[PDB]
Design an enzyme around this catalytic site. Sequence first.
Site, PDB file in Angstrom:
ATOM      1  N   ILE A  13      37.523-106.800  34.276  1.00 37.46           N
ATOM      2  CA  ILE A  13      37.108-105.231  32.622  1.00 37.46           C
ATOM      3  C   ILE A  13      36.163-104.456  32.289  1.00 37.46           C
ATOM      4  O   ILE A  13      36.269-103.471  31.695  1.00 37.46           O
ATOM      5  CB  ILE A  13      38.582-106.065  31.985  1.00 37.46           C
ATOM      6  N   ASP A 129      26.680-102.311  16.270  1.00 36.45           N
ATOM      7  CA  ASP A 129      26.768-101.548  17.446  1.00 36.45           C
ATOM      8  C   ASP A 129      28.340-101.236  17.113  1.00 36.45           C
ATOM      9  O   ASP A 129      29.067-101.527  18.842  1.00 36.45           O
ATOM     10  CB  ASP A 129      26.385-101.888  18.646  1.00 36.45           C
TER      11      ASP A 129
HETATM   12 BR1  LIG Z   1      36.830-109.377  25.144  1.00 37.62          BR
HETATM   13  C1  LIG Z   1      38.054-107.787  25.413  1.00 37.62           C
HETATM   14  C2  LIG Z   1      39.127-107.820  25.286  1.00 37.62           C
HETATM   15  N1  LIG Z   1      40.449-106.588  25.705  1.00 37.62           N
HETATM   16  C3  LIG Z   1      40.011-105.743  26.189  1.00 37.62           C
HETATM   17  N2  LIG Z   1      40.428-105.241  26.423  1.00 37.62           N
HETATM   18  C4  LIG Z   1      40.537-103.991  27.571  1.00 37.62           C
HETATM   19  C5  LIG Z   1      39.466-103.021  28.367  1.00 37.62           C
HETATM   20  C6  LIG Z   1      39.468-102.315  28.737  1.00 37.62           C
HETATM   21  C7  LIG Z   1      40.456-101.329  29.458  1.00 37.62           C
HETATM   22  C8  LIG Z   1      41.825-102.022  29.487  1.00 37.62           C
HETATM   23  C9  LIG Z   1      42.908-101.930  29.971  1.00 37.62           C
HETATM   24  N3  LIG Z   1      43.016-101.533  31.643  1.00 37.62           N
HETATM   25  C10 LIG Z   1      43.934-100.631  32.157  1.00 37.62           C
HETATM   26  C11 LIG Z   1      45.061-102.262  32.135  1.00 37.62           C
HETATM   27  O1  LIG Z   1      44.545-103.397  33.254  1.00 37.62           O
HETATM   28  C12 LIG Z   1      42.810-103.827  32.717  1.00 37.62           C
HETATM   29  C13 LIG Z   1      41.547-102.380  32.342  1.00 37.62           C
HETATM   30  C14 LIG Z   1      41.669-103.466  28.264  1.00 37.62           C
HETATM   31  N4  LIG Z   1      38.312-105.867  26.771  1.00 37.62           N
HETATM   32  C15 LIG Z   1      37.340-106.926  26.216  1.00 37.62           C
HETATM   33  N5  LIG Z   1      36.464-106.605  26.413  1.00 37.62           N
HETATM   34  C16 LIG Z   1      35.530-105.192  27.574  1.00 37.62           C
HETATM   35  C17 LIG Z   1      35.543-103.834  26.919  1.00 37.62           C
HETATM   36  C18 LIG Z   1      35.041-103.309  27.242  1.00 37.62           C
HETATM   37  C19 LIG Z   1      35.182-102.012  27.339  1.00 37.62           C
HETATM   38  N6  LIG Z   1      35.298-101.008  27.810  1.00 37.62           N
HETATM   39  C20 LIG Z   1      35.819-101.702  29.180  1.00 37.62           C
HETATM   40  N7  LIG Z   1      35.826-102.848  28.812  1.00 37.62           N
END
Ligand SMILES: Brc1cnc(Nc2cccc(CN3CCOCC3)c2)nc1NCCc1cnc[nH]1
Length: 301
Positions: A13, A129
Amino acid sequence: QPHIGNYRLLKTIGKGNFAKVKLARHILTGREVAIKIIDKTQLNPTSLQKLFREVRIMKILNHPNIVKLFEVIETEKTLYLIMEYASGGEVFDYLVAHGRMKEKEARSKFRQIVSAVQYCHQKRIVHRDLKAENLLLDADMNIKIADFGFSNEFTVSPPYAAPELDGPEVDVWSLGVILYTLVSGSLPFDGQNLKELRERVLRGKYRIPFYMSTDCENLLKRFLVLNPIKRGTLEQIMKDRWINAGHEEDELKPFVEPELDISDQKRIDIMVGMGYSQEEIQESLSKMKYDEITATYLLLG
Ligand SMILES: Brc1cnc(Nc2cccc(CN3CCOCC3)c2)nc1NCCc1cnc[nH]1
């Protein structure tokens, strides 16, 4: 079926610099988590000493709107940080998809954000940041801020950066940019290229649209000041009129961590069922070890 420790990996992700973030499921509880993977063979002994200091800071941050650390797994070659997963993704992408939040919704999220940043500043930790990629949303639309206390090389932004770009004043500027995105759905400073973007930031002028209240415009002025010494303090901004509208009996105040209940016998009994002994359970919880047991205890709750 790739595993990391007691976790089943599902998908990537996020990625950047020296870090990669995967979604995973905890095998013992079924709970979704985010796992940051850092290849220690990608670092100098200075960078590794840095990483360890910053992991230690992550362990002292316990706030409902800061991405929480569950477990540390470290092999000779890799450091794995298992932390809270925010299923809603980036606030910024939610705003792009759905437009501005109305001031009521924006106030509720901005109170969570100011609380989280003040709580960290109180502990002498500055984010430096705050930006689109680390202001996240969980399944209930609560803010979860990632990467507090982490240097840039361990994380996965010109529109958010204070003009003078290491003290909290840097975060206060970013918070003003964030507030503007929440209430407007757009960034306050932009350009056709980074050179033009930079020039707009240094000029400090941003547009107040017809739908933004005087009280909201007044709040923005406490953050978006070119001189960092004339920026409001977060303990001061917490008393602002806009911030507390509809919270007349409930003024925003510095957050105080709850006492951690490490004595829940139902969860301890479950973990004995999983094969852990009472004694390793008691030691891991009392020492707050961020190990396979303390993670399970938290994920069981
Ligand atoms: Br730690 C941490 C904890 N929670 C998250 N959730 C997250 C980040 C991006 C997208 C989504 C949801 N989509 C749709 C469903 O299928 C999964 C992906 C959830 N990201 C974390 N770090 C990454 C930070 C990040 C910022 N841009 C991309 N990644």
